[PDB]
């Protein structure tokens with residue numbers, strides 16, 4: 001059984017994260033209160049995944065779709081019939097209150113930013129290969145010529161205007177923040193990227209100390225953070241849809257398909 005196979009253990013990421021709260025709810029929804037959820041981090045969990053995959057050792061992680069892990073590995077979602085992880089998750093483009101009128105040109109670009117999951121992986125994979133994000137961003141924009149035209153449609157050039165982009169250091173958001181960062185730099189902007197945790201990121205935006213962020217995962221991941229700063233930020237675009245999250249096992253675990261299978 002799945003309980004037999006993993007010793008009632010889920011390998012997760014960092015404790016302060018959205019997927020970890022959501023998992024807490026999951027374990028509670030499916031009556032898994034004798035299970036152990038290991039907190040770790042992205043780096044640590046993906047390493048533990050690597051060990052177990054190679055050995056064909058059964059493992060249950062907390063996975064999220066917009067990530068290179070589904071590329072480097074044959075993985076799968078355990079079905080969530082109780083939808084503990086919510087649904088219709090999206091990546092959003094947020095700014096500080098009154099950025100759109102302070103800088104109409106920069107907001108135009110930010111609101112027009114869209115791309116797909118594998119287009120983001122185009123970047124994420126090269127970065128995990130050890131390529132420098134700023135180089136991969138440049139390579140990307142000088143490759144996907146038509147996509148940038150979409151984004152920069154009716155967008156003027158500026159004389160060294162300053163812009164502060166706040167990002168949370170998940171691999172997905174290193175992808176997006178750099179690509180957009182580069183687009184702005186090609187446009188003649190003085191671009192700063194400020195790294196922060198989620199929370200400090202939301203605060204920075206809500207208190208004007210950062211201009212924009214491409215790290216808002218709504219509505220499920222940052223339910224609380226979005227609520228907390230309800231009338232104090234701008235949501236000016238969706239940069240991606242169909243992002244999924246939950247319990248992920250490798251495909252070799254044929255007999256484990258639902259979270260329900262853990263009750264056995």
Ligand SMILES: C[N+]1(C)CCC[C@H]1C(=O)O
Nearest residue numbers: 017018019064170217221
């Ligand atoms: C799903 N994630 C791992 C990726 C971005 C948000 C983060 C989380 O808080 O769960």
